[PDB]
Write an enzyme that holds these catalytic residues in place. Sequence first.
Site, PDB file in Angstrom:
ATOM      1  N   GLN A  30       0.785  -1.400  -0.052  1.00  0.00           N
ATOM      2  CA  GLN A  30      -0.217  -0.022   0.027  1.00  0.00           C
ATOM      3  C   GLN A  30       0.931   1.319  -0.034  1.00  0.00           C
ATOM      4  OE1 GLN A  30      -2.577   0.771   3.096  1.00  0.00           O
ATOM      5  NE2 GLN A  30      -1.338  -0.183   4.631  1.00  0.00           N
ATOM      6  N   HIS A  37      -2.643   0.286  -3.983  1.00  0.00           N
ATOM      7  CA  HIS A  37      -3.719   0.735  -3.255  1.00  0.00           C
ATOM      8  C   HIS A  37      -4.274   1.983  -3.605  1.00  0.00           C
ATOM      9  CE1 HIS A  37      -5.933   2.156   0.424  1.00  0.00           C
ATOM     10  NE2 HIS A  37      -6.120   0.839   0.515  1.00  0.00           N
ATOM     11  N   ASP A  43      -8.294   0.858  -3.971  1.00  0.00           N
ATOM     12  CA  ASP A  43      -9.092   1.194  -3.141  1.00  0.00           C
ATOM     13  C   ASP A  43      -9.648   2.546  -3.265  1.00  0.00           C
ATOM     14  OD1 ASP A  43     -10.688   1.405  -0.905  1.00  0.00           O
ATOM     15  OD2 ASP A  43      -9.316   0.402   0.270  1.00  0.00           O
ATOM     16  N   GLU A 103     -11.383  -2.272  -4.843  1.00  0.00           N
ATOM     17  CA  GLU A 103     -11.888  -2.404  -3.711  1.00  0.00           C
ATOM     18  C   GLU A 103     -12.570  -1.188  -3.388  1.00  0.00           C
ATOM     19  OE1 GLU A 103      -8.797  -2.753  -0.699  1.00  0.00           O
ATOM     20  OE2 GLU A 103     -10.267  -3.123   0.874  1.00  0.00           O
ATOM     21  N   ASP A 128     -15.404  -4.534   1.305  1.00  0.00           N
ATOM     22  CA  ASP A 128     -14.673  -3.877   2.428  1.00  0.00           C
ATOM     23  C   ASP A 128     -15.911  -3.261   3.230  1.00  0.00           C
ATOM     24  OD1 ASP A 128     -13.249  -2.279   4.157  1.00  0.00           O
ATOM     25  OD2 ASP A 128     -12.434  -1.015   2.358  1.00  0.00           O
ATOM     26  N   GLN A 150     -12.092  -8.212   2.184  1.00  0.00           N
ATOM     27  CA  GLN A 150     -11.004  -8.026   2.839  1.00  0.00           C
ATOM     28  C   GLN A 150     -11.289  -8.371   4.452  1.00  0.00           C
ATOM     29  OE1 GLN A 150      -9.220  -4.077   5.057  1.00  0.00           O
ATOM     30  NE2 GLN A 150     -10.022  -3.630   3.159  1.00  0.00           N
ATOM     31  N   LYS A 196     -10.074  -7.872   7.998  1.00  0.00           N
ATOM     32  CA  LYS A 196      -9.259  -6.784   8.583  1.00  0.00           C
ATOM     33  C   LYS A 196      -8.754  -7.272   9.642  1.00  0.00           C
ATOM     34  CE  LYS A 196     -13.255  -4.396   6.570  1.00  0.00           C
ATOM     35  NZ  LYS A 196     -14.503  -3.537   6.751  1.00  0.00           N
ATOM     36  N   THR A 229      -3.383  -3.455   9.296  1.00  0.00           N
ATOM     37  CA  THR A 229      -3.346  -1.926   9.456  1.00  0.00           C
ATOM     38  C   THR A 229      -1.809  -1.716   9.500  1.00  0.00           C
ATOM     39  OG1 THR A 229      -3.557  -0.439  11.185  1.00  0.00           O
ATOM     40  CG2 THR A 229      -3.485  -2.348  11.699  1.00  0.00           C
ATOM     41  N   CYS A 230      -1.248  -0.509   9.057  1.00  0.00           N
ATOM     42  CA  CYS A 230      -0.282   0.287   8.997  1.00  0.00           C
ATOM     43  C   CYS A 230       0.287   0.647  10.452  1.00  0.00           C
ATOM     44  CB  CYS A 230      -0.030   1.446   8.303  1.00  0.00           C
ATOM     45  SG  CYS A 230      -1.272   2.724   8.835  1.00  0.00           S
TER      46      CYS A 230
END
Lengths: 413, 413
Positions: free
Chosen positions: B172, B194, B238, B273, B307, B329, B331, B360-361
């Site tokens: 991403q 992304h 996305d 997405e 999503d 997705q 998550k 997640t980042c």
Amino acid sequence: MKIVDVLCTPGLTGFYFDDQRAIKKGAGHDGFTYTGSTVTEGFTQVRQKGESISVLLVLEDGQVAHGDCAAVQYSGAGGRDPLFLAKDFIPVIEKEIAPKLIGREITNFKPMAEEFDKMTVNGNRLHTAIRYGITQAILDAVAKTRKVTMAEVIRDEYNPGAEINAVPVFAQSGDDRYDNVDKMIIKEADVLPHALINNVEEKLGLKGEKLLEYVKWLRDRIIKLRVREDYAPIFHIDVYGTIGAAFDVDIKAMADYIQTLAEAAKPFHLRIEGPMDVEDRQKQMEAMRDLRAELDGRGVDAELVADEWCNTVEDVKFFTDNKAGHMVQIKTPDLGGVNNIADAIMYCKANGMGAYCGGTCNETNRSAEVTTNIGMACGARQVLAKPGMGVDEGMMIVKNEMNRVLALVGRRK
Amino acid sequence: MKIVDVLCTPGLTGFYFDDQRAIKKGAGHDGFTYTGSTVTEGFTQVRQKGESISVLLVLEDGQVAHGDCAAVQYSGAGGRDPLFLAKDFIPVIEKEIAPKLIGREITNFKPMAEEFDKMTVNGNRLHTAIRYGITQAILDAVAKTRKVTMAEVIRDEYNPGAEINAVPVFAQSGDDRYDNVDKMIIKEADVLPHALINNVEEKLGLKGEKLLEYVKWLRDRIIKLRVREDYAPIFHIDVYGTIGAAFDVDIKAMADYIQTLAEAAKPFHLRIEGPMDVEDRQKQMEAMRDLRAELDGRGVDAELVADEWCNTVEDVKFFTDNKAGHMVQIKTPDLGGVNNIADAIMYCKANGMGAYCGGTCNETNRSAEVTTNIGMACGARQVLAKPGMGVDEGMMIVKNEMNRVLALVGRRK
């Protein structure tokens, strides 16, 4: 407990292999890439992916010890072993090193690390990156056999009787010296921010004026952004010889200048790395020694960090014995066997020299975990947040490892 | 095998906690920080350090199992559990969870994970981040007890008899959608980039024209920069509902536009997405289902990724049973217990739907390693390179783990 199997797998790193010769010849830019022909043997692009090799040592009890072979960003550049491509070095490990590991009983870390650090193949020493990875793995194996932390092994074998404590974490900015500083302050880095001051004109200021204002800016930024009043980090700026160039390596002019920086940093303490960059090791040592002596005599508490011309263990001792600076950068992947790291830190300490347990943005998460443990074990003055240039991830990897290590050591302390 | 001790330490993550409500109310973007007053409970600054809690399980044999509790960037936002401050939640683990773990027998992962995922305290469920970290530590304990990989444990308990192979890695870009693409091409990301197309005006184009131009730019950039001719990644963009917003959720118009995207991405396959983001779950399912039917009926081979309004395992079932998109997705941090990731992936697999094992980042290196093992074990369609926004680090953590896991399984294969 014996090693029963050895596995090697290619991998990625926190950054890139860059053709330094080509970039110095004038390689232009195209987005994140560099344009033009390569110049250094093995490169197919001026910028290409960094590579690593994971070395896994399966133990007789089923546990898996893990080290990562890795090299600096300027792999294959002047003075370095060849470009560290996994495909060229995996065969060496599988054919020449694995058979000396399988069936071996796990002893103490030091004898085994030294053996593997110095081993030859066809009369030649192994690549630094291979030595770095194998020795990490041996360290992890010793730790897993003893059921203690890596830190504990090193402390037992190199720093006996010492407490294992938190070590100040240093974070590096690259050219993104303002926004990356904000990240550092929010995450409360203990030392910051490197700032990559590698151009006299554009970064130091022809007369040092720009770096002077930057120090003032940094000082202010910390006060403005800090979450707590008592966050009081140490400044560490790497100037790549530019202070020397801007002031003709005049000891006097360099000291007066650095003194204004220290005044500007107040209240924060200031470390300057690589003030000058001369033609020989001997003359480098001479300048660093004499600049320290001059600052020291005037009672200016600003510290100098030795880096230029100080690569090997012999150099670390050369600089240390001559008090050529106040601190030495221990360039982890370049020393090969990680046992060299511990030896270098203890040597610096015996002579009152602060050891900066460094590294590279182009190594890995595992290799960072392993050297973090070494720096904590030997009481290093600071350790580098690595790998990568994202800042977040390197600080995460090193700090989270540190905390966990402290927790586990506490159960036995 | 029993757990003989439990330790918790506070930690950092790959990113930040951001007070999304404050940002929408006008906080100032200043370097990497936000000035202004907070709006969400718990925050003391609008942007703050991401936090983690490392959970270590010390086993009878002296091995240490390790998981990391973590939450999303918008921790505490609409629909999430409270802001995940380690200082607030370490006491909770220490007083309420640890005593149920110390002296506990290690058996099979699933029953144990389900227990801790569903456990209550004062009649309330555990914060998602806690369930995430405690179940990862459990999975690690079962793997270390059996002397196999986490992936093998999951495969045995959730995908029995299956092979464990590599899975595609998705990277991403955030808003840096050009230079981060160069990184991704250099390191040969399997799926990219992304692109954060989260604004109709600035990013998609009112008529979809900016995204059209970006798809063409990406197609050409890959072709220009790739080292090998047969590097052919998948595109995954996305669009955060912007295609629905821009085309008034008209099924035919959306499809014709997506067809233009597919045509421009050629010869790379395209995944999109969140094309629309409607007013309720039922109507989201209906549009995703209907937009898929139209695309499939036309022979347009572009895939949709669900999503929005797809959150829980029940949601995953719901979208899957209705063919509401081609892929879902997962998550990871949001599901709590990591056993729920496994269950969500296998349900997708049982029913012709591809599972995108995300994250997640704002998670950690360990949490990344653990969910990567689950993804591989269950044959996910792709895994997210995480954490961080540096790109390099997240790709390194996930791909290196992958390779090592494969080499180990290889010995028992």
